[PDB]
Each structure stands twice: as structure tokens, then as C-alpha cells.
Amino acid sequence: KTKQGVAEAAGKTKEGVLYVGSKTKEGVVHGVATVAEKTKEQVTNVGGAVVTGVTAVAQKTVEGAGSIAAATGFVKKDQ
Amino acid sequence: KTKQGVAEAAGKTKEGVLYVGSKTKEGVVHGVATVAEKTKEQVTNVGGAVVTGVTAVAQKTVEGAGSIAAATGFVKKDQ
Amino acid sequence: KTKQGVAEAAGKTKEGVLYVGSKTKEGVVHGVATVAEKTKEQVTNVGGAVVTGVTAVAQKTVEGAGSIAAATGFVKKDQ
Amino acid sequence: KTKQGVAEAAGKTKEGVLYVGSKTKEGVVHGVATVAEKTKEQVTNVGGAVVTGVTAVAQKTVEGAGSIAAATGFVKKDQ
Amino acid sequence: KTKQGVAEAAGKTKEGVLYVGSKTKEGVVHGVATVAEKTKEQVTNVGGAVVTGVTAVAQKTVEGAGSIAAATGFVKKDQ
Amino acid sequence: GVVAAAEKTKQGVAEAAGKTKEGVLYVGSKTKEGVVHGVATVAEKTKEQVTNVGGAVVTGVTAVAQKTVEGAGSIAAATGFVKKDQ
Amino acid sequence: GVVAAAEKTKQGVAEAAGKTKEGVLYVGSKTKEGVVHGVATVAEKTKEQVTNVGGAVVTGVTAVAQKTVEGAGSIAAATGFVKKDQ
Amino acid sequence: GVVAAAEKTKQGVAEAAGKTKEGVLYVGSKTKEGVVHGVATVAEKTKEQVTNVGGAVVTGVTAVAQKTVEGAGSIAAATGFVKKDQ
Amino acid sequence: GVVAAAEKTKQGVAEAAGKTKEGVLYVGSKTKEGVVHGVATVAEKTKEQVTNVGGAVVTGVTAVAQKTVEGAGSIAAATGFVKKDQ
Amino acid sequence: GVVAAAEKTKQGVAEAAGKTKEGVLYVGSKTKEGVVHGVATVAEKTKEQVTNVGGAVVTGVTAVAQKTVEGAGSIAAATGFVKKDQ
Ligand SMILES: Cc1cccc(C)c1NC(=O)Cn1nc(Cc2ccccc2)c2ccccc2c1=O
Ligand SMILES: Cc1cccc(C)c1NC(=O)Cn1nc(Cc2ccccc2)c2ccccc2c1=O
Ligand SMILES: Cc1cccc(C)c1NC(=O)Cn1nc(Cc2ccccc2)c2ccccc2c1=O
Numbered sequence: 001k002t003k004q005g006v007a008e009a010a011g012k013t014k015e016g017v018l019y020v021g022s023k024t025k026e027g028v029v030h031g032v033a034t035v036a037e038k039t040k041e042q043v044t045n046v047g048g049a050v051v052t053g054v055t056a057v058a059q060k061t062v063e064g065a066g067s068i069a070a071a072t073g074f075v076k077k078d079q
Numbered sequence: 080k081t082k083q084g085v086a087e088a089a090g091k092t093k094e095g096v097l098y099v100g101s102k103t104k105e106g107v108v109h110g111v112a113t114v115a116e117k118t119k120e121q122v123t124n125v126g127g128a129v130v131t132g133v134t135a136v137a138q139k140t141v142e143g144a145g146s147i148a149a150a151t152g153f154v155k156k157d158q
Numbered sequence: 159k160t161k162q163g164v165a166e167a168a169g170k171t172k173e174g175v176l177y178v179g180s181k182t183k184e185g186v187v188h189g190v191a192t193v194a195e196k197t198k199e200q201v202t203n204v205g206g207a208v209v210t211g212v213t214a215v216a217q218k219t220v221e222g223a224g225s226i227a228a229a230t231g232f233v234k235k236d237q
Numbered sequence: 238k239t240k241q242g243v244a245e246a247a248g249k250t251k252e253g254v255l256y257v258g259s260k261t262k263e264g265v266v267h268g269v270a271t272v273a274e275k276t277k278e279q280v281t282n283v284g285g286a287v288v289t290g291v292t293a294v295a296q297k298t299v300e301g302a303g304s305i306a307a308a309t310g311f312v313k314k315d316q
Numbered sequence: 317k318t319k320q321g322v323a324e325a326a327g328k329t330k331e332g333v334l335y336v337g338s339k340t341k342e343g344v345v346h347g348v349a350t351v352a353e354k355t356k357e358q359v360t361n362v363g364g365a366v367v368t369g370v371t372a373v374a375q376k377t378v379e380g381a382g383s384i385a386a387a388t389g390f391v392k393k394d395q
Numbered sequence: 396g397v398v399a400a401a402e403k404t405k406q407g408v409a410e411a412a413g414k415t416k417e418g419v420l421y422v423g424s425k426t427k428e429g430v431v432h433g434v435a436t437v438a439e440k441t442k443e444q445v446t447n448v449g450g451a452v453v454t455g456v457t458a459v460a461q462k463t464v465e466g467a468g469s470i471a472a473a474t475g476f477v478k479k480d481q
Numbered sequence: 482g483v484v485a486a487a488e489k490t491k492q493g494v495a496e497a498a499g500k501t502k503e504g505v506l507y508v509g510s511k512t513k514e515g516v517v518h519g520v521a522t523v524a525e526k527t528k529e530q531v532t533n534v535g536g537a538v539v540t541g542v543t544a545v546a547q548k549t550v551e552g553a554g555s556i557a558a559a560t561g562f563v564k565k566d567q
Numbered sequence: 568g569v570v571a572a573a574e575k576t577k578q579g580v581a582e583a584a585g586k587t588k589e590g591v592l593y594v595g596s597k598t599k600e601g602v603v604h605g606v607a608t609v610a611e612k613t614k615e616q617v618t619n620v621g622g623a624v625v626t627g628v629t630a631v632a633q634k635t636v637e638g639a640g641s642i643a644a645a646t647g648f649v650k651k652d653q
Numbered sequence: 654g655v656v657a658a659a660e661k662t663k664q665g666v667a668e669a670a671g672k673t674k675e676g677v678l679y680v681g682s683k684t685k686e687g688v689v690h691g692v693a694t695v696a697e698k699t700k701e702q703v704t705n706v707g708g709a710v711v712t713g714v715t716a717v718a719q720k721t722v723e724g725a726g727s728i729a730a731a732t733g734f735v736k737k738d739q
Numbered sequence: 740g741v742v743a744a745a746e747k748t749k750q751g752v753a754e755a756a757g758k759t760k761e762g763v764l765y766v767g768s769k770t771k772e773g774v775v776h777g778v779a780t781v782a783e784k785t786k787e788q789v790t791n792v793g794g795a796v797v798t799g800v801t802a803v804a805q806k807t808v809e810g811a812g813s814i815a816a817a818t819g820f821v822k823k824d825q
């Protein structure tokens with residue numbers, strides 16, 4: 001047997017109130033906040049890559065080799 | 080046997096109130112907020128890539144190799 | 159046997175109120191909010207890619223290799 | 238047997254209130270906040286990569302070798 | 317047997333209130349805050365990489381060798 | 396006097412505002428005002444006797460959540476002679 | 482006098498504002514005002530006797546959450562002769 | 568007098584503001600005002616006797632959370648003759 | 654007199670402000686005002702007798718959290734003759 | 740007189756401000772004002788007798804957390820004849 005990333009909960013009682021709960025989070029992006037007030041942005045681009053926004057990426061993969069979650073704002077000229 | 084990313088909950092009682100719950104989150108993007116107030120943006124682009132918006136990407140894959148979740152704002156000229 | 163991303167819940171009682179629930183989230187984009195107030199945007203584009211909007215992408219795939227969830231604002235000139 | 242990243246909780250009682258809970262977090266990005274007020278940004282780009290935004294990437298992978306979670310703002314010209 | 321990164325909790329009682337909880341955090345980025353007020357930024361880029369934003373990357377991998385979590389603001393010209 | 400001008404351009408925006416007053420705004424926010432959450436009570440053998448004569452009595456397992464804007468929130472009020480003139 | 486000008490450009494923005502007053506804003510925030518969370522009570526054999534004559538009594542397991550803006554929040558108030566003139 | 572100008576440019580921004588007053592803002596923040604969290608009580612054999620005559624009594628397991636803006640928050644108030652003139 | 658100018662540039666920003674007043678702002682912050690957290694009480698055999706005549710009594714396990722802005726926060730107040738003239 | 744200028748550049752920023760007043764700001768900070776944390780009480784056999792006549796009594800296990808801005812925070816106040824003229 002093999003357990004990986006397993007949340008387990010068990011409870012037992014006779015009389016009363018019993019609560020059992022389990023939660024799991026894998027590759028989760030939570031709570032991203034961004035505020036821009038009275039911001040001046042001047043961009044001149046000639047053949048390049050410019051990123052000024054908000055990017056939130058969450059990736060979960062099984063048996064995946066060589067995977068890329070995020071690739072933001074790049075110039076690639078491989079030969 | 081093999082368990083991966085498994086949420087398990089068990090409860091037992093005789094008299095009363097019993098609550099059992101299980102939750103699972105894999106590759107989940109939650110709670111993204113963005114505010115732009117009185118913002119000035121001037122962009123001049125000639126053959127490039129400019130990104131100024133909001134991007135939220137969530138990807139879950141099984142047996143997937145070489146997968147890319149997000150690729151934002153790039154210039155690719157591979158030969 | 160093999161379990162992956164499985165939410166399990168079990169409950170037992172004799173007299174009273176019993177609640178059993180299970181939830182699963184895979185590749186889910188939840189809660190994206192964006193506000194733009196009194197925002198000035200001037201864009202001049204000549205043969206390029208400009209992105210200023212809101213993008214929310216959720217992808218779930220099984221046995222998929224080389225899959226791309228989102229590709230936003232790019233210039234591709236592969237030979 | 239083998240346990241890795243496992244959260245386990247067990248409780249037992251006869252009369253009263255009993256609460257059992259388990260939580261797991263793997264590759265989770267939580268609580269990112271950014272504020273820009275009265276900020277001036279002037280960017281001139283010629284064939285390069287400029288990144289000025291907010292990037293939040295969370296990646297969880299199993300049996301994945303050579304994986305890259307985030308690659309932001311780079312110029313690649315491999316031969 | 318082998319245990320690695322395992323949180324375990326057990327409780328027993330007869331009468332009263334009993335609470336049992338377990339939490340696990342692996343590769344988690346939590347609580348990142350950034351404020352820029354009245355900031356002036358002037359950038360001139362010619363074929364390089366400039367990064368001025370906020371980057372938060374969290375990666376959890378199992379059986380993954382040679383993995384890179386974050387690679388921000390680099391110029392690569394390998395032959 | 397508030398003046399905004401833009402002349403001899405390709406793309407031009409000119410905005411002029413005399414007086415401006417912003418308002419309250421919520422974006423992806425959660426609020427909880429007067430909320431009762433997660434109350435558990437277990438009783439086996441309770442003997443309760445109440446003898447009330449012209450009064451307010453609150454007895455037993457009580458869970459009250461109140462949210463008032465322009466009024467008063469009370470649970471038990473045994474008063475008398477409440478008058479408002481003009 | 483507030484003047485903003487922009488002449489002989491390709492992209493130009495000119496904004497002029499006399500008086501400005503910002504407001505309150507929430508972005509991805511959580512608030513809890515008057516919140517009761519996680520109350521557990523266990524009682525086996527409780528004997529309770531109440532004799533109330535013209536008063537306010539609060540008895541037993543009580544969980545009260547109150548949020549008031551322009552009023553008073555009370556649990557037990559045994560008063561008399563409340564008057565507001567004009 | 569507030570003047571902002573920008574002439575003979577390619578990209579130009581000119582903003583002029585006479586008076587400005589910022590406001591309160593929350594970004595990814597949590598607030599707790601008047602919050603009761605995690606109260607556990609165990610009682611086996613409690614004998615309680617209350618004899619109230621024209622008063623306010625609060626008895627037993629009580630959990631009260633109050634948040635008031637322009638009012639008073641009280642638990643037990645046994646007063647009399649409350650008057651507001653004009 | 655406040656003047657800001659920018660001439661003969663490629664990218665130019667000119668901002669002029671007469672009077673400015675910043676506000677309060679929270680970024681990724683937590684606040685706790687009037688919070689009761691983690692109260693545990695165990696009682697086996699408690700005998701309690703209360704005889705109240707025109708007063709305020711608070712008895713037993715009590716957990717009170719209060720947050721007031723423009724008012725008074727009291728637990729037990731046995732007063733009389735409260736008047737506000739004009 | 741406040742003047743800021745920038746001439747004959749490639750990238751130029753000119754800002755002029757007459758009067759400026761900064762505000763309070765929190766970044767990744769935690770605050771605790773009037774907080775009760777971690778109170779444990781164990782009682783086996785307690786005998787309590789209270790005889791109150793026109794007064795305020797607080798009895799037993801009490802946990803009070805108060806946060807007031809423009810008011811008074813009291814636990815037990817047995818007063819009389821409170822008047823505010825004009
Ligand atoms: C809660 C409670 C219980 C028993 C004894 C008392 C004194 C209180 N407290 C209050 O009534 C506080 N109050 N007073 C007034 C003014 C007023 C009160 C009574 C009669 C005439 C005028 C009021 C007016 C408009 C909207 C709200 C309110 C408010 O909330
Ligand atoms: C809570 C309580 C219980 C028993 C005894 C007392 C004194 C109090 N405290 C208060 O009533 C505080 N108060 N007073 C006034 C003014 C007022 C009160 C009574 C009658 C006429 C005017 C008031 C007016 C408008 C909105 C709120 C309020 C408020 O909240
Ligand atoms: C809590 C309590 C219990 C019993 C005895 C007392 C004195 C107090 N304390 C207060 O009532 C404090 N107070 N007073 C006033 C003024 C006022 C009070 C009574 C009658 C007429 C005017 C008030 C007005 C408007 C909104 C709030 C308030 C407030 O909060």
C-alpha cells in the first residue's frame with residue numbers, strides 16, 4: 001500500500017453532537033487581490049514581450065514529466 | 080493498492096446529530112479580485128505582445144506529459 | 159486498485175439527524191471579479207497582439223499529453 | 238506501507254460534543270495582495286522581456302521530472 | 317513502514333467536549349503583501365530581461381529530479 | 396475653473412470634473428454582521444420552572460442573531476410607560 | 482484654477498479635477514462584526530427555578546450576536562418611565 | 568493655481584488636481600470586531616435559584632457578541648426614569 | 654502656485670497637485686477588536702442562589718465581546734434618573 | 740510657489756505638490772485590541788449566595804473583552820442621578 005496527500009478523519013460517539021470533516025488542497029491558488037489607483041503606464045514595444053497584468057495559474061498533474069505551469073512574458077528564438 | 084489525493088471521513092453514533100463531510104480541490108483557482116481606478120495606460124505595439132488584463136487559468140491533467148497550463152504574452156520565432 | 163482524487167464520506171446512526179456529503183473540484187475556476195472605473199486606455203497595434211480584458215480558463219483532461227489550457231496574447235512565427 | 242503528506246485525526250467519546258477535522262495543503266498559493274497608488278511606469282522595450290505585473294503560480298505534480306512551475310520574464314536563444 | 321511529513325492526532329474522552337484536528341502544509345506560499353506608493357520607474361530594455369513585479373511560486377513534486385520551481389528574469393544563450 | 400485640453404494628437408482624451416465624491420464598493424469580499432455559527436448543546440435531564448408576572452423571560456437553548464440599522468435590538472425588556480411627545 | 486494641457490503628441494491624456502474625495506473600498510477582504518462562532522455546552526442534571534415579577538430574566542444556554550448602527554443593543558433591560566419630549 | 572502641461576512628446580499624460588482627500592481601503596484583509604470564538608462549557612449537577620423583582624438578571628451559559636456604531640451595548644441594565652428633553 | 658511641465662520628450666508625465674491628504678489602508682492585515690477566544694469551563698456541583706431587587710446581576714459562565722464606536726459598553730448597570738436636557 | 744520641469748529627455752517625469760499629508764497604512768500586520776485568549780477554569784463544589792438591592796453584581800466565571808472608541812467601558816456600575824444639561 002501507499003498513501004500520498006491523503007486526509008483522513010474518524011469519529012465515534014454514543015449520545016450528543018459529532019462532526020467529522022476532511023479537506024484536501026493540491027495545486028490551488030487562493031486569495032489574489034490587486035488594486036491600481038491613479039497609476040500611469042506608458043509602454044513602447046518593438047518585437048518584445050511586456051506583461052503588466054495579473055496572472056494566476058494553478059496546475060495539478062499526475063504522471064506528467066516536463067510540464068510547465070506558467071510561462072509569462074518571454075521571447076523565444078531557439079534554433 | 081495506492082491512494083493519492085483522497086479525502087476520507089467516517090462517523091458513527093447512536094443518538095443525536097452527526098455530520099460527515101469530505102471536500103477535494105485539485106487545480107482550482109479561487110478568489111481573484113482586481114480593481115483599476117483612474118488608471119492611464121498608453122501602449123504602442125509593433126510586432127510584439129503586450130498583456131495588461133487579468134488571467135486566471137486552472138488545469139488538471141492525468142497521465143499528461145509536457146502539458147503547459149498558461150503561456151501569456153510571448154513572442155516565439157523558433158526555426 | 160488505485161484511487162486518485164476521490165472524496166469519500168460514510169455515516170451511521172440509530173436515532174436523530176445525520177448528514178453525509180461529498181464534494182470534488184478538479185480544474186475549477188471560481189470567483190473572479192474585476193472592476194475598472196474612470197480608466198483610460200489608448201492602444202496602437204501594428205501586426206502585434208494586445209490583450210487588456212479578463213480571461214478565465216478551466217481545463218480538465220484525462221490521458222492527454224501536450225495539452226495547453228490557455229495561450230493568451232502571443233505572436234508565433236515558427237518556420 | 239508508505240505514508241507521505243498524510244493528515245490523520247481520530248476521536249472517541251461517549252456523551253458530549255466531539256469534533257474531528259483534517260486538512261492538507263500541497264502546492265498552494267494563498268493570500269497575495271498588491272497595491273499600486275500614484276505609480277508612474279515608463280517602459281521602452283526592443284526585442285526584450287519586461288514584466289511588471291503580479292504572478293501567482295501553484296503547481297503540484299506526481300512522478301514528474303524536469304517540471305518547471307514558473308518561468309517569468311526571460312529571453313531564450315539556445316542554439 | 318515509512319512515515320514522512322505526517323501529522324497525526326488522537327483524542328479520547330467519556331463526557332465533555334473534545335476537539336481533534338490535524339493540518340499539513342507542503343510547498344505553500346502564504347501571506348505576500350506589496351505596496352508601491354508614488355513610485356517612479358523608468359526602464360529601457362534592448363534584448364534583455366527586466367522584472368519589477370511580484371512573483372509568488374509554490375511547487376510540490378514527488379519523484380521529480382531536476383525540477384525548477386521558479387526562474388525569473390534571466391537571459392539564456394546556451395550553445 | 397477647471398480646464399482640460401488636448402490638441403494636435405492622434406489619440407486624445409480630455410476630462411474635466413469640478414467636484415467628485417467617491418462611494419463604497421466591494422470586490423470579491425465577504426461580510427458577516429450579527430451571525431451565529433456553530434452552536435451545539437447537549438442536555439440529559441433538565442428541570443426548569445418559570446413563574447412570570449408582568450415580565451419578560453427567555454428560557455432554554457436560545458440562538459438569536461440581530462442586525463438593526465435605525466432601531467434597538469433587545470432580547471428581554473420588561474419596561475413600562477414608554478411615551479414620545481411630538 | 483486647475484488647468485491640464487497636452488499638445489502635439491501621438492497619444493495624449495489630460496485630466497483636471499477641482500475637488501476630489503475618495504471613498505471606502507474592499508478588495509478580497511473578510512469582515513466579522515458581532516459574530517458568535519463555535520459554542521459547545523454539555524449539561525447532565527441542571528435544576529433551575531425562576532420567579533420573575535416585573536423584570537427581565539435571561540436563563541439557560543444563550544448565544545446572542547448583535548450588530549446595530551443607530552440603536553442600542555441590550556440583553557436584559559428592566560426599566561420604567563422612558564419618555565422623549567419633542 | 569495648479570497647472571500641468573506636456574508638449575511635443577510621443578506619449579504624454581498631464582493631470583492637475585486642486586484638492587484631494589483619500590479614503591479607507593482594504594486589500595486582502597480580515598477584521599474581527601466583537602467576535603466570540605471557541606467557548607466550551609461542561610456542567611454536571613448545577614442547582615440555580617433566581618428571585619427577581621423589578622431587575623435584570625442574566626443566568627447560565629451566556630455568549631454575547633455585540634457591535635454598535637451610534638448606540639450603547641449593555642448586558643443587564645436595571646434602571647428607571649430615563650428622559651430626554653427636546 | 655503649483656506648476657509641472659514636460660517638454661520635448663518621447664514619454665512624458667506631468668502631475669501637479671495643490672493639496673493632498675492620504676487615507677488609511679490595509680494590505681494583507683488582520684485585526685481583532687473586542688474578541689473572546691478559547692474559553693473552557695468545567696463545573697461539577699455548583700449551588701447558586703440569587704435574590705435581586707431593582708438591580709442588575711450577571712451570573713454563571715458569561716463570555717461577552719463588545720465593540721462600540723460612539724456609545725458605552727456595560728455589563729451590569731443598576732442606575733436611576735438618567736436625563737439629558739436639550 | 741512649487742515648480743517642477745523636465746525638458747529635452749527621452750523619458751521624463753515631473754511632479755509638483757504644494758501640501759501633502761500622509762496617512763496610516765498596514766502591510767501584513769496583526770493587531771489585537773481588547774482580546775481575551777485562553778481562559779480555563781475548573782470548579783468542583785462552589786456555593787454562592789447573592790443578595791442584591793439596587794446594585795450591580797457580576798458573579799461566576801466571566802470573560803469580557805471590550806473595545807470602545809468614544810464611550811466608556813464598565814463591568815459593574817451602580818450609580819444614580821446621571822444628568823447632562825444642554
Ligand atoms: C434597548 C432598550 C431597552 C430598554 C430600555 C432602553 C432605554 C433601551 N435603549 C434604547 O431604547 C435606545 N434607543 N432610544 C431611542 C429614543 C427613544 C426611546 C424610547 C422612547 C422614545 C424615544 C431610539 C429612537 C429611535 C431609534 C432607536 C432608539 C434607541 O435605540
Ligand atoms: C441600552 C440601555 C439600556 C437601559 C438604559 C440605558 C440608559 C441604556 N443606554 C442607552 O439607551 C443609550 N442610548 N440613549 C439614547 C437617547 C435616549 C435614550 C432613551 C430615551 C430617549 C433618548 C439613544 C437614542 C437614539 C439611538 C440610540 C440611543 C442609545 O443607545
Ligand atoms: C449603557 C448604560 C446603561 C445604563 C446607564 C448608562 C448611563 C449607560 N451609558 C450610556 O447610556 C451612554 N450613552 N449615553 C447617551 C446619552 C443619553 C443617555 C440616556 C438618555 C438620554 C441621553 C447616548 C446617546 C445616544 C447614543 C448613545 C448614548 C450612550 O451610549
Ligand SMILES: Cc1cccc(C)c1NC(=O)Cn1nc(Cc2ccccc2)c2ccccc2c1=O
Pocket residue numbers: 723724725726727730732735736737809810811812813816818821822823
Ligand atoms: C457606562 C456607564 C454606566 C453607568 C454610569 C456611567 C456614568 C457610565 N459611563 C458613561 O455613560 C459614559 N458616557 N457618558 C455620555 C454622556 C451622557 C451620559 C448619560 C446621560 C446623558 C449623557 C455619553 C454620551 C454619548 C455617547 C456615549 C456616552 C458615554 O459613554
Ligand SMILES: Cc1cccc(C)c1NC(=O)Cn1nc(Cc2ccccc2)c2ccccc2c1=O
Pocket residue numbers: 809810811812813816818821822823
Ligand atoms: C465609566 C464610569 C462609570 C461610573 C462613573 C464614572 C464617572 C465613569 N467614568 C466616565 O463616565 C468617563 N466619561 N465621562 C463622560 C462625560 C459625562 C459622563 C456622565 C454624564 C455626562 C457626561 C463621557 C462623555 C462622552 C463619552 C464618554 C465619556 C466617559 O467615558
